[PDB]
Amino acid sequence: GPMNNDEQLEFLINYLLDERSESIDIPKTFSEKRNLLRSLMNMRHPSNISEEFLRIQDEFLSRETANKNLTSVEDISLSSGKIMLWQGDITTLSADAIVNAANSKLLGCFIPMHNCIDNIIHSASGLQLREECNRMIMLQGGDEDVGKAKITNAYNLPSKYVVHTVGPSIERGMRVSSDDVKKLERCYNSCLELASEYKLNSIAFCCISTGVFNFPQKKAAEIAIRTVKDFLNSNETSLNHIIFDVFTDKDYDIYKKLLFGN
Ligand SMILES: Nc1ncnc2c1ncn2[C@@H]1O[C@H](COP(=O)(O)OP(=O)(O)OC[C@@H](O)[C@@H](O)[C@@H](O)CO)[C@@H](O)[C@H]1O
Ligand SMILES: [Zn+2]
């Protein structure tokens, strides 16, 4: 019984629904079915699942990834030495490592359909990403501190690895402290160091802490660029491309000014 795309979606939804206590009339349209799969994956605490599920999940998500408009590193025109600036979706970029602005529990996002980068990454990667992270935290015996990095396989993403970092959060209407700056610096440093240790050719950062974490976007960009330039000026590294993956026009305009205003 080889399965077509729709049968794979049905199988995945039904497997996860059978695990849940709640009853949900199965949706009809493609948006409703796909969004249900993502919701159920989002909510699923780590627990053993069938080799069959994971096989089918991988086929489905891998096929979804292949059918996106993907970007290779060599496709990116806008570079300043090893630094690249690129606006787009990090789940469609075939960098060796992408950086996830993760939470301190590191299991991804359990809020269904939440468009934080953590949810988006886990949703495209597969449930193995949450599982790998669960193991790491279990063994660590504790929540992940801000300003660190853990690397995992990227699974069904077009990248090879996900580097998970937890950034500083700025409370509504409060200024950034020196400690806040040092924490964000540390996230950039820790990701660059880990990807360098793993002998990677490329890493793509998201704009850490500038979404829901309210880090002022000019200030964050200045830190990110300074930390990356200091790192390249001070270290031998396998890294040949450090990609600033921006998601908003506002971030693009900021990074463009800072990198190419010269
Ligand atoms: N597909 C995409 N590709 C590239 N960039 C994307 C993206 N989707 C969103 N972004 C951008 O990712 C950055 C981090 O935002 P986010 O709001 O995801 O992240 P942060 O502001 O760093 O806040 C951290 C929280 O999300 C975190 O602690 C947890 O609670 C998670 O569960 C912002 O610049 C977003 O616009
Ligand atoms: Zn979220």
Author numbering: -1 to 260
Authors' description from the paper:
To gain a closer understanding of the functional role of the 3α-bundle and coordinated Zn2+ ion, we solved structures from the three sub-branches of Zn-Macros namely from S. aureus (SauMacro), Methanobrevibacter oralis (MorMacro), and macrodomain-fused SirTM protein (Mfs1) from Fusarium oxysporum f.sp. cubense race 1 (Foc1Mfs1) in their apo form as well as of S. pyogenes (SpyMacro) and MorMacro bound to ADP-ribose (ADPr). In all structures, the Zn2+ ion is tetrahedrally coordinated with three metal-coordination residues within the Zn-loop, while the fourth coordination-contact is exchangeable and is provided by either ADPr, a water molecule, or a symmetry-related protomer within the crystal.
Surprisingly, neither MorMacro, which arises from a minimal operon containing only the Zn-Macro/SirTM pair, nor Zn-Macros derived from Msf1 fusion proteins could demodify SpyGcvH-L. In contrast, all Zn-Macros could demodify Glu-/Asp-ADP-ribosylated PARP1 E988Q.
